[PDB]
Symmetry: D2
């Protein structure tokens, strides 16, 4: 569907920051800085610029006050200045709306391209950025739940193979995926920096942003987040987890900000930088693929995701998935999942694992 341009792909380094529209800047500030302990690079009455403990670029998260909570841009750092020109020609050849600012769209970023990409997502490409104090040895500042890096984004899109091919052309390498025996793809993970992923597609009504993911050093740092959320009596904002993922093998947690933007806390996946890095495909009915301990996937995880904006700041039209639903085929009334393939013991039919059905 999406052809490969003749123009060369920009050389993408890694996911770098997201810009999220939030409704109430103070309430968001409490969440990101007071609960989560992210580091303020800059803030005013309109925006809060936040970085992780080990980051030296200006920010990993920008929160912008607005009327409608949404993703405004997912940004990728490119290797050279010229790569911003290479990105522009690329998305031009594709027929996508693009916007170039030599001065950047946000503080702490220089020359940048924003695009409405083929999947309806607002991507940013940029090289130039304001270096700040790298806080990686500032143990006087370290919190028990310290967020040390931006790791990845996850995008909800109807047709996964279509998006996958397009990301592949752009230079992302696919590391794992979820399929069924009848040829349906439910999800795919792909990378540039040599971790399991820098972004990922999740099958579903799209464009929507599923989540943004930050890394911690150790599993006990993720346990601390949960513990702190209990003490602040906000455990209702813990959406799902903690657990160990099947796909990626990372220890994980999903939480929800004031505007229901989903944040993932993530640690200890594996190295993927070799070009013949072996791929891993999971069957959708495998009850260890998402939570390795067989714990049930929370139904909100499959249905809820953030709005995304176009370049005029307007919410993008959602298109409905027509391929089968992961929720439905695993935990819905006609779904099933298994612990050992072909074994009736430890399998679930028409309900989730651990004795639950959908609420």
């Amino acid at each position: 569907e999406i052809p490969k341009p003749v123009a060369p792909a920009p050389d993408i380094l890694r996911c770098a920051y997201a810009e999220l529209v939030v409704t109430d800047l103070a309430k968001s500030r409490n969440f990101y800085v007071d609960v989560l302990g992210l580091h303020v690079s800059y803030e005013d009455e309109n925006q809060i610029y936040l970085r992780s403990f080990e980051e030296f670029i200006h920010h990993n998260l920008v929160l912008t006050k607005g009327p409608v909570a949404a993703l405004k841009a997912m940004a990728f750092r490119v290797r050279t200045p010229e790569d911003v020109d290479k990105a522009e020609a690329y998305y031009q050849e594709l027929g996508c709306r693009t916007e170039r600012r030599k001065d950047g769209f946000v503080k702490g970023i220089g020359d940048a391209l924003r695009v409405e990409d083929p999947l309806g997502f607002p991507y940013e490409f940029f090289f130039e950025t304001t270096h700040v104090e790298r806080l990686h040895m500032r143990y006087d500042l370290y919190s028990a739940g310290e967020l040390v890096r931006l790791d990845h984004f996850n995008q909800v899109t109807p047709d996964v193979p279509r998006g996958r091919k397009y990301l592949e052309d752009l230079g992302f390498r696919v590391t794992e995926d979820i399929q069924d025996d009848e040829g349906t793809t439910y999800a795919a993970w792909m990378h540039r920096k040599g971790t399991v992923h820098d972004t990922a597609l999740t099958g579903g009504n799209g464009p929507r942003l599923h989540h943004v993911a930050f890394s911690t050093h150790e599993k006990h740092n993720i346990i601390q987040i949960c513990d702190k959320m209990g003490a602040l009596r906000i455990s209702d904002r813990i959406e799902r987890g903690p657990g160990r993922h099947g796909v990626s093998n990372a220890f994980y947690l999903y939480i929800l900000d004031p505007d229901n933007h989903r944040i993932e806390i993530y640690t200890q996946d594996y190295y993927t930088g070799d070009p013949d890095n072996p791929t891993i495909t999971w069957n959708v009915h495998d009850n260890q693929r998402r939570d390795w301990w067989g714990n049930p996937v929370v139904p909100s995880w499959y249905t809820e995701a953030s709005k995304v904006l176009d370049l005029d700041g307007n919410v993008q039209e959602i298109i409905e998935r027509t391929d089968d639903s992961e929720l439905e085929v695993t935990i819905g009334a006609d779904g099933f999942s298994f612990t050992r393939a072909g074994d009736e013991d430890g399998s679930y039919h028409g309900q989730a694992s651990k004795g639950f059905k959908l609420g």
Copy 2:
């Protein structure tokens, strides 16, 4: 009401071991030894004797081959040889059936008393025991999921207040409980050794044994047990967890052995040895009381538990609870739970937390 005897209670030091009857010895061995890493002190075609990493007494668990899987004895060590006589007098005055074996009921234990207690539970009291090599610095043997001590038992009984009074008289001090505003007690925790408990009472049809708990050093050790069960493709034997308890504050996991005896893995509760240790009462509707992160309590946790035997080796008849059911008042069709008292937001009506209903 169980009367306080005139006879002095045995000075109980701690929970010491449990004797569990199992149907297939070889399968059971694979779980406790090969999966969980417990250390064999003795075995034959009929029994397996197992101790934790820091134990010096002969064993913490005895698996005994039998035709019906059940708790045969929950054993407590007492401070002196003389306390065994005390225990016999005490139980006789209560009108209970007792049996005394000067050379013990199981290997590695000397003079012992077993009783059918007023709650219908098979308790043992002993002092004499064969000292073995204490493995506390045998780091050459240390597993990534190493089980380091026996921590507690947990008992299902229909009338908690009644059992509580009897256990206080016996010298246990209640450290935490769960109650509602209408007079109902759903569970109680009680100790001798200065941790949160040596046993506890869980409201339900009983006598049934709810679980036996072992401790790890660190939270990562419990994570590894989950990870290993995932690798062995027996995640369906993970019943509930891992999580942070409210009551007790401990990190925890619950897993099911081949006869569905429930085992808890536990770490990092607090010191309770001062005689005026503050008692903590939780409301039964508080959705952070069992799992602090608010994850739903799996239904089987409330409905399933092991049979217990009398002194003749027959299963004790089960007496139904008539008091309110914790399951029903919190996660049942007319149930209710809350995150913040008096707040509707993050409350649950007629269902479980995180988007689930009972399957």
Copy 3:
């Protein structure tokens, strides 16, 4: 030989708090509160009262402004009010000075007895204390190096067997000790609460206070204290560690406060509550006894310790040890230590392990 009184010992529960005299109260506040994260129960111009994360009694540590930095009192909590009576009668029979104050010596303590004990140490015994908010679930307050309990004191005294027998009559049970093949005892560890110790004797010139130890939950919380002191550029106040102890098997770290009072951080020793708990004796020349990894023991650890005060607030006269010196016999010019008993390989003559002499 200190005689055994006819009067019964008081029932001691555990070590409870220390009172340290400090010379600059602001400078000390910065260390114990800002660096270490101790929680303030009460403060004014003259005194700071601090508790650990899991404590429900008023405080574990009192910092008292004064002219000469010293130990003012090491306090042990007793099981009942009448144990303070037993304590007074006990020490009086011993011929020791006593002072009783019905309203206590520091805020938050009630009826209290302080004594100049047979070894020159200021011991306190009390029962009454003001209960405070137990912060054990206050994870919104939890530091990456959080101190969770008061664990023990360690005293320096010239004649270890003499002190040992006195502490034994007083109800403490020896757990581990250090001796040589010539009859000399160098150190002894003894307890009431069922951990390795509540106090301990280190041979040397005394009465002096070697240290006060606080516990953490996990090994990484001790690592963080080190990492924080690095980031505050006060690494010169890390005296020794971190490491794994041979004796006690605890993970450990020694640091120095503004007045050189030594503080230990400690986690994960083993259960000692059974009366036949197997005692362990190490040879003084075993290079794994103090640090299990063989790392050398810093000479200041052997030579430096705090002054103690008598009941009139004057520094106790120091009596010189004549028994052999641990320092000299192990790491001095004619000292010796071994890795494997009998083996010349991995032994050290006239120097420290790992390639070092003493400066």
Copy 4:
């Protein structure tokens, strides 16, 4: 002084494996397999092939029986089969001895080029390697001390700047170095894979191999290695640590194999893949540069290192450093180090930190 070739550099992915010659195969196997838990990919009477938990290529270490313990090859994987031709051309232009084997030098490596590089080190470049089962989710085989990846090499060489420029032409990017005000360089670290390093240069008599480094997931894994070595009564084989590095910010430990080959265990350094990644220069006298906590650097760490072999299997002649010795300027009789720059308090003159002097 090493000129840049006109021939394009091979595209280097990462350090891949080391081949070490050992004198007693059986004893070396005990150390690497039974003590350290590395995984066998192939073994016979002459050689052991070992890999780390997360590796998919054939091996990360080859132990080769032979007369003199030494490094035989340090191998880097390249991007494409063609990069092997490029490396041959590159080194031929340098005037270095080369040897090309189309079916490789060791099992499970295909087309390979070995060389005697300008510093005298036997480098290998390959692309082709036999894929093996990636053990990253094999938690049934995970050890409490698990080694999860090969992270880096560290080479000892007399002229750090000379070596630095040659590695830079070869595509390695410098991340951190150690220098003094007089203009001497003592040490430099350089990468390809996006971590602090794939190889490093330590100033000293060379060519020697300083160490081979493996990563763990968490800091506790490294503490387990030290605990297990105390239990095996081989703590004398613990050379240095465990510690937090200043350079790299990684938690670390140095141990010694039966042939005195040094192994580093290492975790949690930071991301370096952006092309403008800030370089960090430390002053040689800063006592927090090597151990962040101020612990002394063991002198053997500076003086001892492994012989390396030329292409005929003969040991390479060692050239003496004429630049200043890091040992002598920091811990030698004329050296010094500081905690805070310019502050004499926490400074050390003519000795090491923590009250120690050179052995």
